[PDB]
């Protein structure tokens, strides 16, 4: 089985890697083997003196703290966002733009960006007076928790994969990781897209035809939208993968609606299993959220993302076709 897994891992540089098949072949360790594969591909172990046994130990511990009984926000989703971010980092319009520390931060942020997700939304945790909403004062409750867990696990035995970074380097990475994961809060999507459009309008390139980023504000803004695009990348994948992600998020939404109904609360959108329209929700999800975001990203890295945008529009056309 080790040979079959190594064959599938050869697609790690490709959009639409079959991450579910990799989860099978790796014994439900997609996050660990995909992160390890990416770290070798980018030669991140030698650059930052990361001991290989420290890396595997942390990745296994981080993967354990993703809930296996949550349908969508599990370790497969984490591995999917890591691998999608890895491909977006390699796009020609961004060649040699980001340093090795920014690359490490963006990939590490993707790996921890949903750790210990309980399968319910921020608003549910706020409305139900949960301990998490109490700890974090109703502000980016899940995203603050993911960061806290992801950093604390570095202190477990033989788990500090940043042990050989300089104190300056650790200081810069920690701030960049926090800025990125906090930007995955869906309540910040509109402001994140609005700033991304302003950058597309005022786009500037270098003499090598490569995106020019002068300052931390523009650089972290591109990294924020990149991980945000990978988080919202399910409808841009081949349909057989997209549909599996749709089935998983609808199961998670339906389970929250059952808890909302059992508590006497008003059911959140798309969460009532007795009056849900999966196809129309997917169409509205693409039209109002996913396509505006990816169309803007495609303008930023034009024409590198045209095939991804083509697949998204074909999938939107298909989900529409099932309605009549
Ligand atoms: C809460 C809102 C507004 C969006 C969420 C964002 C989320 C959780 C991002 C991944 O962490 O994924 C999807 C969402 C959603 O509403 N739908 C319909 C989806 N359909 C198919 C696949 C993923 C999603
Ligand atoms: Mg999240
Ligand atoms: Zn996510």
Swiss-Prot record:
It comes from the Eukaryota. Mg(2+) binds at residue 114. It is linked to Genetic variations in PDE4D might be associated with susceptibility to stroke. PubMed:17006457 states that association with stroke has to be considered with caution. Residues 1-324 form the PDEase domain. GO terms for biological process: adrenergic receptor signaling pathway; cAMP catabolic process; cAMP-mediated signaling; cellular response to cAMP; cellular response to epinephrine stimulus; establishment of endothelial barrier; negative regulation of adenylate cyclase-activating G protein-coupled receptor signaling pathway; negative regulation of heart contraction. Long isoforms that share a conserved PKA phosphorylation site in the N-terminus are activated by PKA through phosphorylation. Isoform 3 and isoform 7 are activated by phosphorylation (in vitro), but not isoform 6. Sumoylation of long isoforms by PIAS4 augments their activation by PKA phosphorylation and represses their inhibition by ERK phosphorylation. Homodimer for the long isoforms. Isoforms with truncated N-termini are monomeric. Isoform 3 is part of a ternary complex containing PRKAR2A, PRKAR2B and AKAP9. Interacts with PDE4DIP. Identified in a complex composed of RYR1, PDE4D, PKA, FKBP1A and protein phosphatase 1 (PP1). Isoform 5, isoform N3 and isoform 12 bind RACK1 via their unique N-terminus. Binds ARRB2. Interacts (via N-terminal region) with SHANK2 (via proline-rich region); the interaction is increased in a PKA-dependent manner. Mn(2+) binds at residue 114. This is 3',5'-cyclic-AMP phosphodiesterase 4D. Zn(2+) 2 binds at residue 114. 3',5'-cyclic AMP binds at residues 73, 282, 285. The active site is at 73 (proton donor). Its main location: membrane. Belongs to the cyclic nucleotide phosphodiesterase family. PDE4 subfamily. Changing residue 138 to R: Abolishes homodimerization. GO terms for molecular function: 3',5'-cyclic-AMP phosphodiesterase activity; 3',5'-cyclic-GMP phosphodiesterase activity; 3',5'-cyclic-nucleotide phosphodiesterase activity; ATPase binding; beta-2 adrenergic receptor binding; calcium channel regulator activity; cAMP binding; enzyme binding. It is found in: Apical cell membrane; Cytoplasm; Membrane; Cytoplasm, Cytoskeleton. Zn(2+) 1 binds at residues 77, 113-114, 231. Transmembrane segments: none annotated. Keywords: cAMP, Cell membrane, Cytoplasm, Cytoskeleton, Disease variant, Hydrolase, Isopeptide bond, Manganese, Membrane, Metal-binding, Phosphoprotein, Ubl conjugation, Zinc. GO terms for cellular component: apical plasma membrane; calcium channel complex; centrosome; cilium; cytosol; membrane; nuclear membrane; nucleoplasm. Signal peptide: none annotated. AMP binds at residues 73, 114, 231, 234, 282, 285. Expressed in colonic epithelial cells (at protein level). Widespread; most abundant in skeletal muscle. Hydrolyzes the second messenger cAMP, which is a key regulator of many important physiological processes.
């Amino acid at each position: 089985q080790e040979d079959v897994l190594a064959k599938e891992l050869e697609d790690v540089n490709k959009w639409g890697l079959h991450v579910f098949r990799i989860a099978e072949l790796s014994g439900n360790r997609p996050l660990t083997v995909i992160m390890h594969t990416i770290f070798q591909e980018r030669d991140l172990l030698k650059t930052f003196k990361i001991p290989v046994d420290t890396l595997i130990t942390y990745l296994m511990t981080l993967e354990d703290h993703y809930h296996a009984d949550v349908a969508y926000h599990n370790n497969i989703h984490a591995a999917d966002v890591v691998q999608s971010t890895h491909v977006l980092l390699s796009t020609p319009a961004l060649e040699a733009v980001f340093t090795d520390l920014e690359i490490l931060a963006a990939i590490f942020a993707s790996a921890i960006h949903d750790v210990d997700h309980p399968g319910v939304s921020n608003q549910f945790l706020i409305n139900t007076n949960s301990e998490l909403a109490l700890m974090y004062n109703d502000s980016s409750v899940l995203e603050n928790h993911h960061l806290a867990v992801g950093f604390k696990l570095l202190q477990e035995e033989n788990c500090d994969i940043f042990q050989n970074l300089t104190k300056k380097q650790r200081q810069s990475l920690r701030k960049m990781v926090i800025d990125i994961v906090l930007a995955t809060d869906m309540s910040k999507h509109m402001n994140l897209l609005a700033d991304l459009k302003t950058m597309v309008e005022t786009k500037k390139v270098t003499s090598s035809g490569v995106l020019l980023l002068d300052n931390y504000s523009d650089r972290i803004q591109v990294l924020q939208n990149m991980v945000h695009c990978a988080d919202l990348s399910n409808p841009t994948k081949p349909l057989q993968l997209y549909r599996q992600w749709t089935d998983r998020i609808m199961e998670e939404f339906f389970r929250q609606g059952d808890r909302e109904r059992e508590r006497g609360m008003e059911i959140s959108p798309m969460c009532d299993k007795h009056n849900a329209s999966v196809e129309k929700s997917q169409v509205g999800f693409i039209d109002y959220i996913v396509h505006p975001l990816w169309e803007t990203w495609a303008d930023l890295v034009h024409p590198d993302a045209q095939d991804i945008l083509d697949t998204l529009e074909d999938n939107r056309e298909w989900y529409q076709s099932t309605i009549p």
